[PDB]
Amino acid sequence: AVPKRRTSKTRKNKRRTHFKISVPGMTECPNCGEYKLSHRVCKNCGSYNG
Amino acid sequence: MEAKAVARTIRIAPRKVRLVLDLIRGKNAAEAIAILKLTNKASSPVIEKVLMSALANAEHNYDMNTDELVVKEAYANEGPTLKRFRPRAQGRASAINKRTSHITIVVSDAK
Amino acid sequence: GYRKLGRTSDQRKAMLRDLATSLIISERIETTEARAKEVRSVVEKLITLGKKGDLASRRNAAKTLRNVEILNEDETTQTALQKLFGEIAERYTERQGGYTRILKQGPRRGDGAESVIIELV
Amino acid sequence: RDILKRPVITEKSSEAMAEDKYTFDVDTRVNKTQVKMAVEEIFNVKVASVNIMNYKPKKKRMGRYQGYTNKRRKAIVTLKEGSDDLF
Amino acid sequence: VKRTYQPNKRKHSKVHGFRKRMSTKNGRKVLARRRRKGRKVLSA
RNA sequence: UGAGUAGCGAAAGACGGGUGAGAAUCCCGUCCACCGAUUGACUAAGGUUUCCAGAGGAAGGCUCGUCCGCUCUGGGUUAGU
RNA sequence: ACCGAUAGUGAACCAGUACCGUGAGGGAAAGGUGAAAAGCACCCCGGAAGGGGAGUGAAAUAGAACCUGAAACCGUGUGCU
């Protein structure tokens, strides 16, 4: 099926209310001192330290 | 005083870039450098450079210590696009767009 | 089975035979997350047999392992099956289960797939 | 007379040809019998055989204007005596 | 399927060649037009 | 605008070690799988430099690319039968 | 008391050409830095591309995608709702 009417700038900008990516949710490592992903290894130097 | 940096004619499309620019607009320098390094999107290795080189003008041309800086302006604009075609079924063709963007970051000491 | 790994039932069983064989000859590989949760259960069931050392035990292990030659021994070559009974089994006799450790790495370019590192303990 | 134009000094014409096999670049409307006479009058040697081959024009500069190079004719003389065809 | 154009070097020059068009009266008149328009090639 | 939507053109890959600013995709090694009156080896028409070596990564390649039938600089075809 | 780059010759721009067709045949698009190249030495971020300074110049928001630079369309901030 084809669209019957054009879509306005208003109705297009409401649809994308929810089209956004979220924060990666990271924490500082207690060696590197640099932000790392949770439950992963520090890329800068690898120390999981379970 | 504010130092700016531009990357003109990057090949990622503009409304793919805009998804990342939001996550950093308003954050702090060291926080912004870390978000662009732990995100899975494809515009991160390019946007990060434009930010790592706004901080090299914030200290070598002017004189500001790079710890107390915030990201004040971060937007992506349009660029000239490339025309391409892909042949479809039964002797017909359709166009393609290879879109381009300009990226811009301004860092400032809130003064 | 457990989970299908996105392959046909005959290719799925042919990959849990060649992945479980490199982990024995290398002892530290790097693969995808969902595969790793599948070779936790195939490897650690080859070690259990290797801790017996019967003849009916060896002739069950051989059904899985491939025939690869390990030439990095200082001089002689030792077949993989010889190295499951003669060396890996001796290292893990006191322990009861849990011969393997999994550590996540993060997303990987080109695919967004999750890397992991899985190592014999 | 002077049918020859210029020697050819490249790889494969430098060593495995170095010995009694000299490459010349000749006019595009001569036969091989004529080259067996011009080489003996210009250099005073004794020629064993001559081989010849022709090349087709190439496409030249992709950038800007497009065009063709020239066609050439490459000859190869083998000396039964003597040396010093080119230095 | 078997498309309509099956290339051939001998048959191209025996039908559309130069020595074909110079043989009949109506052919030398096709050269008189392509030459008056300024075409780059005369006889394809 | 439709919309970050349909599609990405029949088919088995896995790991280790290199190179690199950057690797599911490039190079080397082992194992596994597919064709085998053929997806193997020769030649006709036709195409007309697509062949090879060292460099290159804007465009083209339905993704990436350090790679290429793409780009730059030099090479390559020899007959008394 | 003709045109001024969608005009005037198809053609102010290597056009009867790029290309399209077995062939006869058809047939486009494309002008302007500055008075003068004086076409950005050197420094910094980056693999580069591209930028931020310093300089040339009367002017670089005149930097070769170069006078002026309208509308559709795409964004960033904000005063009332």
Describe the fold and architecture.
Chain A: Belongs to the bacterial ribosomal protein bL32 family. The structure is cut from a larger assembly and holds chains A (50 residues), B (111 residues), C (121 residues), D (87 residues) and E (44 residues). Chain B has helices at 14-24, 29-38, 44-52, 57-60, and strands spanning 2-10, 70-78, 82-87, 93-98, 101-108. Chain B has 111 residues and is α+β, with helices and mostly antiparallel strands. Chain B has one domain: Ribosomal Protein L22, Chain A (Alpha-Beta Complex), CATH 3.90.470.10. Chain B has a 3-stranded antiparallel β-sheet. In chain B, strands 3-4 form a two-stranded antiparallel sheet. In chain B, strand 3 and strand 4 (93-98) form a beta hairpin. Chain D has 87 residues and is of the alpha+beta class. The two termini of chain D are 20 Å apart. With 44 residues, chain E is mainly α. Chain E has one domain (1-44): Helix Hairpins (Orthogonal Bundle), CATH 1.10.287.3980. The chains are: A alpha+beta (50), B alpha+beta (111), C alpha+beta (121), D alpha+beta (87), E mainly alpha (44). Chains in contact: A-B, A-C. The structure holds 2 RNA strands.
Spell out the key features of this protein.
part of a larger assembly, 5 chains, C: 121 residues, alpha+beta, 50s Ribosomal Protein L17, Chain: A, three-stranded antiparallel β-sheet, two-stranded antiparallel ribbon, globular, E: 44 residues, mainly alpha, Helix Hairpins, elongated, RNA-binding
CATH class of chain E: Mainly Alpha
Provide the gyration radius of chain E in Å. 13 Å
User: Strands of the biggest beta sheet of chain D: in what spatial order?
Assistant: 1-2-4-3
Our estimate of the beta-strand percent of chain D is 25-35%
Q: State the assembly state of the protein chains.
A: part of a larger assembly
Q: What CATH architecture of chain D would you give?
A: 2-Layer Sandwich
CATH architecture of chain E: Orthogonal Bundle
- CATH topology of chain D, what is it called? Alpha-Beta Plaits
Count of spatially separate domains of chain D: 1
- Please name the CATH topology of chain E: Helix Hairpins
Strand content bin of chain E: under 5%
Largest interface: A-B, 9 and 11 residues
Order of helices and strands of chain D: EEHEE
Supply the number of helical segments of chain D. Answer: 1
The biggest sheet of chain E, with number of strands, parallel, antiparallel or mixed sense and barrel status, is: none
Pfam families (chain A): Ribosomal_L32p (PF01783)
GO cellular component, one term (chain A): large ribosomal subunit
GO molecular function (chain A): structural constituent of ribosome
Protein name (chain A): Large ribosomal subunit protein bL32
